[PDB]
DNA sequence: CGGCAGTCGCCGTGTACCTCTCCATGAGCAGCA
DNA sequence: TGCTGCTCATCAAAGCTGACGGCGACTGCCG
RNA sequence: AAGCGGAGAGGUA
């Protein structure tokens, strides 16, 4: 398996960071298998697929609401079960009215998973619409969701095998011209860092 | 320091020829990377 | 103190009614410490004669 | 300007004048430079070998 | 009926998830025995259910003679079916021989059922 | 956004010569008696 | 069935605490 | 025709 030379990674400054424009902490995470990194993403297939994917996500959220309404009606019946002897019988009101707070927790329960799935789908779609090369994705769950739903349209890995791809897919001329442009007409810490 | 590298490499190859799951194999690759980094410059990061 | 960890971790691995003090005491760390101090140290020095 | 030098660096004055005299031919854009005072530990590690 | 499918079903019946633990070479058997003893002594059997070390009988060649020697499938790795609780974590971690739990990033991960199956059928 | 001051890590710290000591272990696994 | 010769492995970690100046990345942090 | 590497301590100008 490919490895990296220690001299060009743990140096001051980190001469491998200046080349890929990454912070040394990110290199420390990626190289020793503690974070994922995407290397390339083709934008055309993503571009002409937005409508279908968002429609499918809307269908998935409708699937959530399908369970939502039934859960709401079941909760209503469960609360009516306790309400059957609430203000009409001789049962002490303490527990028979704290079951109302229990039912507040119950009605929040279904909306909990509902909002969980809503947020899940929203963040997945937003991340898939924001992906750019050299972005770190910790917490595998997100990466699994991305590689299952949007399995194509991007590539990402972990370790020195991905650093190799990042170095290979680097255009010296374009970066050099951009940096020279910045140092030519620029002001602030940007000029110092580009120099 | 050569011996540890050439032992860890052989263990990684044997474990990678058995169709082992991803987690174990990447843990082994991390250990190999640490071994090589300790060969070239010992104590630069972590514990010597 | 280094023998204490061994004696404390040896009692949770075997069967009771067979444990004896002659079975939980390992002498080697103490003699190793003594031999490492009296020789090969910075304050036990070769005499001037 | 058109002197292929990197601003903010230190170059020997002989090469500086040679480069300027070469660039003032077939065109012209002299570079701008200022004298610098350097220690004996920085000038020792900035040699040409 | 495929034996692997039956084993997969019987494992799906068992509670908990499977996890991997890194240990030292030449310690697997003693680590297993000590793990079982510490589990039975601490009454943590409600968390730790099984401890197993896959092994295969490989034909070792001694001077041209083939003899079946048991060699571990995963050198220094053991598998335990359990639930991730703090007490169980501490109990399994502080056992003599255990160095740590192999897993992605920081939180240990659970093996898929197929991977566990592929390392349990009688093959040696 | 825009600076910013304290912090944390790494670099260096005289030359030549003489004499003496010490340098891994613990468990495991055969091989006998 | 128990002394004793032959063999092998680097993942260890509870201990450590009396240097001091120069220089730069940087990083959380405040405005 | 056949070897000689590390660590620690004390001294001399």
UniProtKB/Swiss-Prot annotation, chain A:
* Top-level lineage group: Bacteria
Which pairs of positions does the record mark as disulfide bonds? none
Q: What induces it?
A: 6-fold repressed by starvation.
Subunit structure, as described in the record: The RNAP catalytic core consists of 2 alpha, 1 beta, 1 beta' and 1 omega subunit. When a sigma factor is associated with the core the holoenzyme is formed, which can initiate transcription.
Q: Which family does it belong to?
A: Belongs to the RNA polymerase beta' chain family.
Its biological purpose is as follows: DNA-dependent RNA polymerase catalyzes the transcription of DNA into RNA using the four ribonucleoside triphosphates as substrates.
Q: What is the protein name for this chain? A: DNA-directed RNA polymerase subunit beta'
State the organism named in the record: Mycobacterium tuberculosis (strain ATCC 25618 / H37Rv)
Recite the lineage of the species: Bacteria, Bacillati, Actinomycetota, Actinomycetes, Mycobacteriales
Q: What stretch of the complete protein does the chain hold? A: 99 to 293 of 1316
UniProtKB/Swiss-Prot annotation, chain C:
Q: What is the effect of changing residue 30 to A?
A: In strain: vr1; rifampicin-resistant
Q: Which domain of life is it from?
A: Bacteria
Q: List the disulfide bonds.
A: none
Q: What does this protein do?
A: DNA-dependent RNA polymerase catalyzes the transcription of DNA into RNA using the four ribonucleoside triphosphates as substrates.
- UniProt family annotation: Belongs to the RNA polymerase beta chain family.
Subunit composition and interactions: The RNAP catalytic core consists of 2 alpha, 1 beta, 1 beta' and 1 omega subunit. When a sigma factor is associated with the core the holoenzyme is formed, which can initiate transcription. Interacts with CarD, TRCF (Mfd) and RbpA.
Its name, as the record gives it, is DNA-directed RNA polymerase subunit beta
Q: What is the lineage of its organism?
A: Bacteria, Bacillati, Actinomycetota, Actinomycetes, Mycobacteriales
UniProtKB/Swiss-Prot annotation, chain E:
Name the chain's protein.
Transcription termination/antitermination protein NusG
Q: How does it assemble?
A: Does not interact with Rho.
Q: Does the keyword Kinase apply?
A: no
Q: What does this protein do?
A: Participates in transcription elongation, termination and antitermination.
Is Transcription regulation included in the keywords of this UniProt record? yes
Q: Which domain of life is it from?
A: Bacteria
Key words of the record = Transcription, Transcription antitermination, Transcription regulation, Transcription termination
Concerning its family, UniProt says:
Belongs to the NusG family.
The gene that this protein is the product of is: nusG
Q: Which GO terms describe its cellular component?
A: cytosol; peptidoglycan-based cell wall; plasma membrane
Q: GO:BP terms for this protein?
A: DNA-templated transcription termination; regulation of DNA-templated transcription elongation; transcription antitermination; transcription elongation-coupled chromatin remodeling
